[PDB]
Amino acid sequence: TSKKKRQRGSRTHGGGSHKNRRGAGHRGGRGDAGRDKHEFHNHEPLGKSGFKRPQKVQEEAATIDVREIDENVTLLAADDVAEFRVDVRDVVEEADDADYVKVLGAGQVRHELTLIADDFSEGAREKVEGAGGSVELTDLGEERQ
Amino acid sequence: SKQPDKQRKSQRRAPLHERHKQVRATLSADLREEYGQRNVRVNAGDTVEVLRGDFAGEEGEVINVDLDKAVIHVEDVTLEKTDGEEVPRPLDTSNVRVTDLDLEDEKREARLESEDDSA
Amino acid sequence: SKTNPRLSSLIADLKSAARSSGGAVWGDVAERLEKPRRTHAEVNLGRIERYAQEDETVVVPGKVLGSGVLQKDVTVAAVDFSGTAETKIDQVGEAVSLEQAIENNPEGSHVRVIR
Amino acid sequence: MQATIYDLDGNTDGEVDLPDVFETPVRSDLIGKAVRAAQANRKQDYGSDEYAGLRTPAESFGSGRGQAHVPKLDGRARRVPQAVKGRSAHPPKTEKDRSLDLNDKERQLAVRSALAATADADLVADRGHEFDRDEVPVVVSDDFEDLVKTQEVVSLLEALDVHADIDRADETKIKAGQGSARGRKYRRPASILFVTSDEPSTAARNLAGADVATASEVNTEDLAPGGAPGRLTVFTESALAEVAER
RNA sequence: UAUGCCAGCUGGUGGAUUGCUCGGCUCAGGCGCUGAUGAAGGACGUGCCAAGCUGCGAUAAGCCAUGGGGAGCCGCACGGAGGCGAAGAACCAUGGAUUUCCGAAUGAGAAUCUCUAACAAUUGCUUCGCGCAAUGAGGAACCCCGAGAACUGAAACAUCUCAGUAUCGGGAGGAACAGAAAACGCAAUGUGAUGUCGUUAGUAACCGCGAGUGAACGCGAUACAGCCCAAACCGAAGCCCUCACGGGCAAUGUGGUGUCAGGGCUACCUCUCAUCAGCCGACCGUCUCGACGAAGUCUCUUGGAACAGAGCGUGAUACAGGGUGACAACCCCGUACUCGAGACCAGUACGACGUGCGGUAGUGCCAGAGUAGCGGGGGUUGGAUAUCCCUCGCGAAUAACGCAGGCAUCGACUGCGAAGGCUAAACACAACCUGAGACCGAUAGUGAACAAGUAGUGUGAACGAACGCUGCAAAGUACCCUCAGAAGGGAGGCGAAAUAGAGCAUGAAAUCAGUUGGCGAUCGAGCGACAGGGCAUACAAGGUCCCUCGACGAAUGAC
RNA sequence: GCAUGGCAAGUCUAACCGGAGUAUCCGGGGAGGCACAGGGAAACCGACAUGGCCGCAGGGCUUGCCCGAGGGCCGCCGUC
Ligand SMILES: [Cl-]
Ligand SMILES: [Cl-]
Ligand SMILES: [Cl-]
Ligand SMILES: [Mg+2]
Ligand SMILES: [Mg+2]
Ligand SMILES: [Mg+2]
Ligand SMILES: [Mg+2]
Ligand SMILES: [Mg+2]
Ligand SMILES: [Mg+2]
Ligand SMILES: [Mg+2]
Ligand SMILES: [Mg+2]
Ligand SMILES: [Mg+2]
Ligand SMILES: [Mg+2]
Ligand SMILES: [Mg+2]
Ligand code: NA
Ligand code: NA
Ligand code: NA
Ligand code: NA
Ligand code: NA
Ligand code: NA
Ligand code: NA
Ligand code: NA
Ligand code: NA
Ligand code: NA
Ligand code: NA
Ligand code: NA
Ligand code: NA
Ligand code: NA
Ligand code: NA
Ligand code: NA
Ligand code: NA
Ligand SMILES: [Sr+2]
Ligand SMILES: [Sr+2]
Ligand SMILES: [Sr+2]
Ligand SMILES: [Sr+2]
Ligand SMILES: [Sr+2]
Ligand SMILES: [Sr+2]
Ligand SMILES: [Sr+2]
Ligand SMILES: [Sr+2]
Ligand SMILES: [Sr+2]
Ligand SMILES: [Sr+2]
Ligand SMILES: [Sr+2]
Ligand SMILES: [Sr+2]
Ligand SMILES: [Sr+2]
Ligand SMILES: [Sr+2]
Ligand SMILES: [Sr+2]
Ligand SMILES: [Sr+2]
Ligand SMILES: [Sr+2]
Ligand SMILES: [Sr+2]
Incomplete structure (x- = not known):
């Protein structure tokens, strides 16, 4: 039995509060949004080189x-x-x-x-x-x- | 084709000239020998024996052949209405067997006797 | 939850020998084969040549590969060998299956584990 | 090992070396994978109309009339998944890749393994096939290919104490379920597989549950229908030898 | 025991469920243009009785011919009456006839009609006369040329993104478009028209260098195919209409030659199988349609029915699928094998007719201008100095010349000849035909299994449902009684079943009538869980339970 | 990432081609991808098939002492 197959009856399918899994706000913006602000961590730094x-x-x-x-x-x-x-x-x-x-x-x-x-x-x-x-x-x- | 829907469909919607094959019945041992065929298209002249329904065992002359409903009326194979009148109980040819042919038509007889073609 | 019926039987047989004979290796090897495939041994000849010694059966709880050069005359026992591996080894020594090794030495003595 | 050759009368007529492949260790897991892949690969892509339930300008009235915010048209709810006549939320899709890849080596190993299961009488019997013979597979003189009448193949099989398997396959099952509405009303046991060399046996093919093949292209499904190894087979002198190099 | 609570029983209501599938959905292969010779579409007619659908057109569910087919027929649609058919009907294929009005709609006008011979309008030719012709509109998408958003993403937002997307204008075909290098630039002693597919590669390049955008050469494949003008040199040697006579065109150049394996010219060698033009004209293959086509309808039992069980037997190059009163290779249609026709491949390939390839030497005779190129301003692109295009301005050389090789100039080197043109095949789509399915199975699947784009809503653009199932056979209930009664009811008849009697297989829940058990008009509200008492209980599918005494006897533990 | 499975210093074919039982399947196709060397903007240069010590599992012995894969701490090598 897989994890997916066990979600029925759980309501939130592992998402925590049902208010979490909505639009891109739950990801802090789409794609690499925030790579220099709220999600700068572990991102290659900005700039040209060579x-x-x-x-x-x-x-x-x-x-x-x-x-x-x-x-x-x-x-x-x-x-x-x-x-x-x-x-x-x-x-x-x-x-x-x-x-x-x-x-x-x-x-x-x-x-x-x-x-x-x-x-x-x-x-x-x-x-x-x-x-x-x-x-x-x-x-x-x-x-x- | 192999699909049931198409099979039944091609049968229910077949044009008139293709419905004759829906009124064919197996031939008796003698007749099969006499014309080299296993079956034929039941005509309103032939004699036939019932081999399956509630009238299995009875023999009689075919009084009518309905291509539209692919069924036949055989003499004495009837039902009694409420008023008392007697009406025919339609028969599917595949439950019948021809034991005597009406060859009053040269073409049918010619068709039957030919070898390259069957009637 | 192994899928290969042979690997499954090898493991059972490897436990039978360890529990019935004076061997700790077989049961040891059995425990490693039970572990996930990614942890199983993947050894080239160059490593056998460096740590093996004659008359001491080399035991690989995995598969033996053909890179490098083997000169020592040793009997290598592995779950499987690549075509080239089994060829090079057989030239200067001998390639054997754990199934054979277990039969010619249930006690599992004078044997060195390599990975 | 050696395999006994038989003539159309069913009498012994010499014998040949059973090729090395028949010694390949039986691998039911690999065979199952191979069959699973061939079966998936012939499945047709399907999926509901992508605009189904979307052909409507239905709109929600929002708050105000004491009604749930459901798109409606002509006073009827529409489009959304919870609406009768609404779109399907996560339906079958045509773009889905329904095929399964399989390395050539891994697949070929499966064929060999399936061939080998054919030489083990106990397995063949465990698979279900009925027969009163000890040696297996059944090897026959290449003249088998020249046969024409189905019944002539019947005689040979009866003479070979192998016809019982066809009696087994001479029972069709009318399946439970709606497969019937789509042309899958019947199903039946798998019987003897005939492997010839020039052309498939036209004479044997109509036998109940029979399958025919040619040594050059006989596949895993042929040798192990449903992925279950050990099919009661009958090879042709030349087929047996040609199959050796698969 | 009233009103009443809980559960069930009989009967309703309702239409879930199970089973069934004439409809969908999706994939695959084939095929593919129609129209002034008036299409597609619409309107109105057309039947013995005819409202809807289908067909058809005042010759109106049809007329004629040829072939097929066959003893029946008169559509969906099972009525009544009547008729047609051996003078071979029905039905099917091919071809033909008829084919109202509106409609591009074309004599003028008009909500499908009217008014007084008509290519209206725009064009080409022209016998200058509508005499001969073209255009117009349609088609599911696909295709080509133009016009061209925003929501959105960037967590705001302006460049950027969404996107050259949606949508709009114009236009062709069965496919379009592209296409025989002023190419490429794995730089080479190398490749050699063009699509497309795989890859090259999220690489190079772009970018508030943010988010994001994003090729190409090459390579492996598919399919392959290469030619024609302008000019030089010739100069009427020519073309079009007409049966002809005759007419028109054409020195502002018809026609010959020629086209980077450059050509022409003068002088020579040799030779043609190149090319171009026309003639002939398939095999095979694929798709579809059709003909032929083996073998049980034997016994007994059950059943309304045998296609069931048991027994005996048979065919198979046919044990795909369907039908038939129930599980059918052998009862019927088919199916395998074999065979026939049409369509596509294709007016292609092959073949044949004619033409004549190529080479040397000489000759500054010819070889496409607002071009190549530069500058200003825009758009666009991966195109960065190095994309493609528009716009304003400027503006060259003449093969001894010119363009390109990812900044500019000059030299060298390598490649290639722009400013004229055509071109099969391989690829896109799915209207149409056929086939297929681990797709859905009537609140699903199309909006649509049914009257379906129907009924119905809106001035209009436009919006838009629901409705499947008697039975083996209609045997679809005669006669009688009742009643105001073709109603309904009662009795009765049919059938295995009417609790199969018309939205007529099954028949859940909510819920209603009647009724059975328990409770009930002095008593308290998450409606129960667990214990224990009352009362109630046909069988089946559960068979245990109680009291004396005795045995065993944990923690605990006396009088 | 992970579990399982094939093959292994390699591995996999893509389009597509032939066959056939014709969407399955058998054979062919290695173009190209990732891996087999890195470092450096670039020019450009280019590495331990083991040298030392600990020591788990396992093996050996005359039962504490040896050998000790993997692992651990160092050396050393390539390049900026
Ligand atoms: Cl190694
Ligand atoms: Cl090149
Ligand atoms: Cl670089
Ligand atoms: Mg005959
Ligand atoms: Mg829906
Ligand atoms: Mg079911
Ligand atoms: Mg008019
Ligand atoms: Mg934003
Ligand atoms: Mg832009
Ligand atoms: Mg930002
Ligand atoms: Mg873009
Ligand atoms: Mg390039
Ligand atoms: Mg519906
Ligand atoms: Mg009912
Ligand atoms: Na949630
Ligand atoms: Na709609
Ligand atoms: Na797909
Ligand atoms: Na077509
Ligand atoms: Na009507
Ligand atoms: Na007509
Ligand atoms: Na005209
Ligand atoms: Na005129
Ligand atoms: Na935002
Ligand atoms: Na905003
Ligand atoms: Na930008
Ligand atoms: Na190359
Ligand atoms: Na029948
Ligand atoms: Na400009
Ligand atoms: Na160039
Ligand atoms: Na319904
Ligand atoms: Na390669
Ligand atoms: Sr989670
Ligand atoms: Sr949303
Ligand atoms: Sr994020
Ligand atoms: Sr910052
Ligand atoms: Sr009819
Ligand atoms: Sr009818
Ligand atoms: Sr409000
Ligand atoms: Sr070419
Ligand atoms: Sr030129
Ligand atoms: Sr330069
Ligand atoms: Sr309904
Ligand atoms: Sr649809
Ligand atoms: Sr309005
Ligand atoms: Sr009655
Ligand atoms: Sr006690
Ligand atoms: Sr491979
Ligand atoms: Sr390569
Ligand atoms: Sr180490």
């Missing part, structure tokens, strides 16, 4: 952490096995509707890897090299200077 650059001048990079790559080395058998050699671009999803692929350095790298991507974070290298691996910046990646 700016926005045009959407067609904005770049959306596709990122991935070494942790994701590294954990799936063996499973990624469909990708080079050298002295592994993996082109991140062939690994990252949504890597099409993105302007470039960037490898981030979150996690560990328990293997020696030769990674190919448009860009890497400082920590991404330090780890990949630290595990006897190498990092190769793509032709597009040749936009750092």
Whole structure:
């Protein structure tokens, strides 16, 4: 049995005095009425802030952490096995509707890897090299200077 | 259709030429064999036997066939009014069985005997 | 008010074993499964790998998921495993149902709860 | 496991591997959900006329004549819900979404589970079906599809000690209530479900309570009418195998 | 025991309830224009008897033909009389005939009539004559172009909101509108007419930066289709009416060429299957309508009736639904299967006729002006500097030029050619047809199951109800008595039932008449709850209860 | 938010397409949404698959002592 189903006979259906549930007065005005007066509490404050650059001048990079790559080395058998050699671009999803692929350095790298991507974070290298691996910046990646 | 309201409606409001089918009665064993049909449209000439009402068992000649009310009058199947007069007690054909046909009409006989069509 | 007849039987069986054998885990696990679904365990392999030890049956009062890497040779016992989870585990160890575990160890000994 | 195959005479004629799906654990809750959804999804939207009771300029006289402030026209109360001939306060509405969603995976699991309930004789009998057989479901040679006469299917079923279920469904019930006024006067027990592979069995379909289906599209309602698992089924050699990959 | 209180009984009153459904409500599919060749609508007529409805129109519930259909028929509507039908009626489909007056209403006028040959009025053509033609008005909504609120929200209120909503003016169709880039701008080595649907997204943008308002490109789909002029170069090579003769139009340009895969011209290569025009002309599919169509009306019992129970039997590519004196696959209509016709798809697709695609070189020959663009003032929009439009003023270039890419200018780059035009399909609606339903079931559902937009109200605009059910069959009560009496009553007849006898299935409560039990003319008012006494009680559906004594014997507890 | 259920580092399809027993239903459709990294107005940069100590449930042992998921207090890392 639901709460609704138990209201018959109650008269006020949980509203308290029958004088309460009327028009918008019972809500202090309609919608966000009073967000700066009687109901200012917990409301975002008033005001403008910052700016926005045009959407067609904005770049959306596709990122991935070494942790994701590294954990799936063996499973990624469909990708080079050298002295592994993996082109991140062939690994990252949504890597099409993105302007470039960037490898981030979150996690560990328990293997020696030769990674190919448009860009890497400082920590991404330090780890990949630290595990006897190498990092190769793509032709597009040749936009750092 | 499948809806009862429409079914009864199509029956009560059917035009005259479509009411003949509302006065059809099953044929005797012989006649079914003779004309290759299970039933026919009861004519005011045929002979029929009552198989259901209070007059079940009686046989007689059909004296009248009312298409408007989809009912038939059979000789001797009557009720006695208060004044004493005798009036027919209308019968639904589905409670009757034809045991002898009146083929005085070439078309009916022709229709009955044809195979592609039934009477 | 569980809806799944199997989960319901698992719980009954989990209580039978705890009450009849020298096990406190089974009844313990039974109490947690009785709790709302949102509180049940949802564990990835990366966590089993970090706190499990061989020859010690891992007991998950929930479901096991496939993220991370498991290398230790352990017998993981859970209410259910995702397809990938049961695959990775079976490679380096073994995936088992609480129903099996309860049968091969009613006393519920040498077992570690993970969530 | 293995399932015994039968020929149109009803004699054993070899046997085949009962596919793995029939081993799927029976889940009456999932099956019930699936049936509940198919049943809801074919329901038609309805609702009272949105202007019903509103076609009137009726007005209240307010205070003054010792009368309740009820809109009136020609001395008659109207429009308001407490007024005879007034609008319906919270009536059925056409805009209401009367359908139920169901994840494809969850739905498919239900089909498999319903298929599996078909292989458990005890369940099938608990569901209500009448039969003096031990093995279930009933598997038959693909020549079953070539049958044409209903009675020829009767003979086979009697030879298979399964015709008793049709005798069960050979009783219609004239329901209580006004469903009758809307064309729902009768109802009847569900009997045997025939699952063929090329086309539904035209020869079996008219059997009392019988349902016919094709392995490629047989659904949960087919396997578990009303959501109750364990329908006495009869598959076709090929149907049995094609159903294996649902 | 008067007046009277409480409960019940018999009979009323009343029309709840239960059951029933010829009406609603909603959804889905199909279909879709009518009118001066006088529509839609209205008025008045029209029947043997005819008030209402329906039909019809002085040939008036109908006339003729072809096909279907069939032994009956003369509408709703069960009367009386009479008639029609084998000379094949009724009825149905298609086509035709008749079709009063008012009505856009059109000779003039007028509350449906009148007065003395009429496209009135506005137009095009014109034989300049109303000679040939067009327009007008209607249609449930849908659609296109204009005009355009307020209540309301912002807890007041002015910008904002409600909302380009309500409502108004004009107009088309079966669908409208849009539409082959002076596009887009995931900026690209990329997309490639237009609707619409899903999404992009409550994102960008707007905003007393408050409340609120709110796209697009793209993407996935649906459906797909692309062309014609102006000019250049030609210059009467042309068009319209008429059978013809003949007439009219047309150098202020008919016609050819041509249309950003730019074109033309001069000189060449090659070739056409592009396009445009016309001819032919479906399959399939969908919707509807129709034909055909299996198998019990066997026994016994109950009943007024078998469609019930028990027994025996049968069909099924048919066990949807309905009817029939009660629960029916097999009694009747239908239903499955198969088959036929019409409508839509569609004058579409295919096919065929003709035309002829395209390429090189040269040539500043052509290519839409109050325009592009700027400024003042307004409105509008998400459009912010960067929306769309109106208004006042100003105002260009000529492809070697010009516009666009979300502030302005200049260069570069990329895209694209405005100021001419047409265009199928995919989408909206629901009048009309058919189908459907966990919708309502006569105070419900439409206002309307019935005389329903009826009766009735208002000067008018406009407002607007209520009314369903005899029975299997009318067998709808003969005869007699009474009475002023076709009334009513009594007796009687019918039927299973008249407590089914006319708003005639059932028949609640309030309440009324009569009456039974209890109380009652010396007595006090939330009408009762719980205890206990009196009196009252056919059966059934409850069977317990009382006294002596004895056993057990909590708290408590004596003489 | 919550209860239940499927699937799970993923999850769900929308319109719509094919089939069919033709509004149900079977198959297809991942466009796109939310989740899988954050911080910053922006430019732009880009993180603990565990380093320490407590310790509940549970497990172990030779019955106070170990292991101690979750949890608790810290460290440390990304960014302004
Ligand atoms: Cl930004
Ligand atoms: Cl985890
Ligand atoms: Cl594009
Ligand atoms: Mg014949
Ligand atoms: Mg109403
Ligand atoms: Mg009822
Ligand atoms: Mg006149
Ligand atoms: Mg206000
Ligand atoms: Mg505005
Ligand atoms: Mg304010
Ligand atoms: Mg707006
Ligand atoms: Mg755009
Ligand atoms: Mg009504
Ligand atoms: Mg009555
Ligand atoms: Na209240
Ligand atoms: Na009204
Ligand atoms: Na709806
Ligand atoms: Na139409
Ligand atoms: Na009349
Ligand atoms: Na006429
Ligand atoms: Na005219
Ligand atoms: Na003239
Ligand atoms: Na206010
Ligand atoms: Na005010
Ligand atoms: Na504003
Ligand atoms: Na894209
Ligand atoms: Na009958
Ligand atoms: Na201006
Ligand atoms: Na552009
Ligand atoms: Na009524
Ligand atoms: Na996706
Ligand atoms: Sr409350
Ligand atoms: Sr109010
Ligand atoms: Sr509020
Ligand atoms: Sr303030
Ligand atoms: Sr995507
Ligand atoms: Sr009639
Ligand atoms: Sr009649
Ligand atoms: Sr006053
Ligand atoms: Sr196209
Ligand atoms: Sr031009
Ligand atoms: Sr710029
Ligand atoms: Sr009434
Ligand atoms: Sr209505
Ligand atoms: Sr007045
Ligand atoms: Sr009498
Ligand atoms: Sr004692
Ligand atoms: Sr899916
Ligand atoms: Sr921790």
